[PDB]
């Protein structure tokens, strides 16, 4: 019902300039500050302080700081989020980068 009050409270911000946004865009963010177990802020003490790898969080608000507790508490990076691959100059698992492509010697041999 929290997800609810938060959503209704945001849709009546979409109407605060009359403009439309499909349910899905807000209902995702509304579900982000809910899927934790309660209510979480869209700040460095909500999303940037949780579970995500040492580099996904240091990329916003607090940096040197976040990276310092990555060091002392011998932390680890997945290399699974955006921000992770971003730093490394790699093809992140985003859209075209998600799936990997190979060649079947078999399907390759058929054509000739």
């Amino acid at each position: 019902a929290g997800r609810a009050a938060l959503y209704k409270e945001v849709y009546n911000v979409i109407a605060s300039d009359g403009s439309y946004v499909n349910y899905r865009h807000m209902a995702l963010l509304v579900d982000v500050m809910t899927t934790q177990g309660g209510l979480t802020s869209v700040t460095r003490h909500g999303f940037n302080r949780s579970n995500t790898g040492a580099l996904m969080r240091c990329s916003f608000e607090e940096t040197v700081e976040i990276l310092f507790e990555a060091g002392a508490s011998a932390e680890l990076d997945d290399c699974r989020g955006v921000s992770e691959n971003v730093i490394l100059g790699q093809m992140a698992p985003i859209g075209t980068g998600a799936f990997d492509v190979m060649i079947d010697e078999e399907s390759l041999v058929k054509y000739m």
Binding site: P93, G95, T96, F99, D100, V101, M102, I103, D104, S107
Partner: protein
């Protein structure tokens, strides 16, 4: 470790992303002097020839569709429906 070709909850349609990367990897390879599995019917642009390759569905590429849990499923360019 993976998953077999029977047991696929993965959309049997190619994604607009898979289209762009197959048609791109073929654009790269075909410009990289790579073998052309289609008759070069007046076609000379690498990226273009690669498009008349997905047409004749004679691209040797297979897509590794990884599940976010860990394991994966395989699909060839022939295996994917192109209703894109």
């Amino acid at each position: 470790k993976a998953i077999p070709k029977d047991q696929r909850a993965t959309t049997p349609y190619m994604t607009k992303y898979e289209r762009a990367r197959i048609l791109g990897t073929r654009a790269l390879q075909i410009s990289m002097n790579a073998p052309v599995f289609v008759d070069l019917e007046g076609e000379t642009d690498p990226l273009r020839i690669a498009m008349k390759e997905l047409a004749e569905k004679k691209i040797p590429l297979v897509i590794r569709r990884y599940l976010p849990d860990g394991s994966f499923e395989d699909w060839s360019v022939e295996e994917l429906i192109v209703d894109l």
